[PDB]
Amino acid sequence: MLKCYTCKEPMTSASCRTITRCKPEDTACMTTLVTVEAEYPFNQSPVVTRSCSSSCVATDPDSIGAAHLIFCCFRDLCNSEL
C-alpha cells in the first residue's frame, strides 16, 4: 500500500518522519510546509505535517490551517525529509 512519512499528530516542531500506511483508496501523499510560527510550543526549526491524500494538487484556498506549501507525490516515501 501507499506509505508516507507521516507522524502521529502536529505537536513536535520536528522529527515528523514515520513510515505510515495510507488507505487503500488513497494513492498519493501530502505535505504541509510552514516555517512561520505563532506561539509555543515551537522550535528554531520549521514545522510540517504530512498526511495521506487521494488527489495530489497544489492549491492554497483558505489556508486557514497553516496550509502554505503543499508538497504531494505518487510514490511511497517519495520524500524522506522532515
From Swiss-Prot:
<feature type="domain" description="UPAR/Ly6">
    <location>
        <begin position="3"/>
        <end position="52"/>
    </location>
</feature>
<dbReference type="GO" id="GO:0007626">
    <property type="term" value="P:locomotory behavior"/>
</dbReference>
<dbReference type="GO" id="GO:0070062">
    <property type="term" value="C:extracellular exosome"/>
</dbReference>
<feature type="disulfide bond">
    <location>
        <begin position="56"/>
        <end position="72"/>
    </location>
</feature>
<keyword id="KW-0225">Disease variant</keyword>
<feature type="disulfide bond">
    <location>
        <begin position="22"/>
        <end position="52"/>
    </location>
</feature>
<dbReference type="GO" id="GO:0005615">
    <property type="term" value="C:extracellular space"/>
</dbReference>
<dbReference type="GO" id="GO:0001775">
    <property type="term" value="P:cell activation"/>
</dbReference>
<feature type="disulfide bond">
    <location>
        <begin position="7"/>
        <end position="16"/>
    </location>
</feature>
<keyword id="KW-0964">Secreted</keyword>
<keyword id="KW-1007">Palmoplantar keratoderma</keyword>
<dbReference type="GO" id="GO:0038195">
    <property type="term" value="P:urokinase plasminogen activator signaling pathway"/>
</dbReference>
<dbReference type="GO" id="GO:0010839">
    <property type="term" value="P:negative regulation of keratinocyte proliferation"/>
</dbReference>
<dbReference type="GO" id="GO:0030549">
    <property type="term" value="F:acetylcholine receptor activator activity"/>
</dbReference>
<keyword id="KW-1015">Disulfide bond</keyword>
<comment type="function">
    <text>Has an antitumor activity. Was found to be a marker of late differentiation of the skin. Implicated in maintaining the physiological and structural integrity of the keratinocyte layers of the skin. In vitro down-regulates keratinocyte proliferation; the function may involve the proposed role as modulator of nicotinic acetylcholine receptors (nAChRs) activity. In vitro inhibits alpha-7-dependent nAChR currents in an allosteric manner. In T cells may be involved in regulation of intracellular Ca(2+) signaling. Seems to have an immunomodulatory function in the cornea.</text>
</comment>
<feature type="disulfide bond">
    <location>
        <begin position="73"/>
        <end position="78"/>
    </location>
</feature>
<protein>
    <recommendedName>
        <fullName>Secreted Ly-6/uPAR-related protein 1</fullName>
    </recommendedName>
</protein>
<comment type="subunit">
    <text>Homodimer. Interacts with PLAU. Interacts with CHRNA7.</text>
</comment>
<dbReference type="GO" id="GO:0005576">
    <property type="term" value="C:extracellular region"/>
</dbReference>
<keyword id="KW-0202">Cytokine</keyword>
<dbReference type="GO" id="GO:0050884">
    <property type="term" value="P:neuromuscular process controlling posture"/>
</dbReference>
<feature type="disulfide bond">
    <location>
        <begin position="4"/>
        <end position="29"/>
    </location>
</feature>
<dbReference type="GO" id="GO:0030336">
    <property type="term" value="P:negative regulation of cell migration"/>
</dbReference>
<dbReference type="GO" id="GO:0007155">
    <property type="term" value="P:cell adhesion"/>
</dbReference>
<dbReference type="GO" id="GO:0008285">
    <property type="term" value="P:negative regulation of cell population proliferation"/>
</dbReference>
<keyword id="KW-0732">Signal</keyword>
<dbReference type="GO" id="GO:0005125">
    <property type="term" value="F:cytokine activity"/>
</dbReference>
